[PDB]
Each structure stands twice: as structure tokens, then as C-alpha cells.
């Protein structure tokens, strides 16, 4: 989904 700490995006 939306960007993440480094996972999502």
C-alpha cells in the first residue's frame, strides 16, 4: 500500500 518505512514504497 502507501509508501512505508522502507517496505511499502
Short mmCIF file of N, CA, C and O in Angstrom, two decimals:
data_model
loop_
_atom_site.label_atom_id
_atom_site.label_comp_id
_atom_site.label_asym_id
_atom_site.label_seq_id
_atom_site.Cartn_x
_atom_site.Cartn_y
_atom_site.Cartn_z
N UNK A 1 0.83 -1.18 0.00
CA UNK A 1 0.00 0.00 0.00
C UNK A 1 0.88 1.24 0.00
O UNK A 1 2.02 1.20 -0.46
N UNK A 2 0.34 2.35 0.51
CA UNK A 2 1.08 3.60 0.57
C UNK A 2 2.51 3.34 1.00
O UNK A 2 2.79 2.34 1.66
N UNK A 3 3.42 4.23 0.63
CA UNK A 3 4.82 4.10 0.98
C UNK A 3 4.95 3.67 2.44
O UNK A 3 4.03 3.88 3.23
N UNK A 4 6.09 3.07 2.79
CA UNK A 4 6.32 2.61 4.14
C UNK A 4 7.73 3.00 4.58
O UNK A 4 8.47 3.61 3.82
N UNK A 5 8.08 2.65 5.82
CA UNK A 5 9.39 2.97 6.36
C UNK A 5 10.47 2.49 5.40
O UNK A 5 11.61 2.95 5.45
N UNK A 6 10.11 1.55 4.51
CA UNK A 6 11.05 1.02 3.54
C UNK A 6 10.47 -0.24 2.91
O UNK A 6 11.05 -0.79 1.97
N UNK A 7 9.33 -0.70 3.42
CA UNK A 7 8.69 -1.89 2.90
C UNK A 7 7.71 -1.51 1.80
O UNK A 7 7.94 -1.80 0.63
N UNK A 8 6.61 -0.85 2.18
CA UNK A 8 5.60 -0.44 1.23
C UNK A 8 6.26 0.12 -0.03
O UNK A 8 6.43 -0.60 -1.01
N UNK A 9 6.63 1.40 0.01
CA UNK A 9 7.27 2.05 -1.12
C UNK A 9 8.69 1.53 -1.27
O UNK A 9 8.90 0.33 -1.43
#
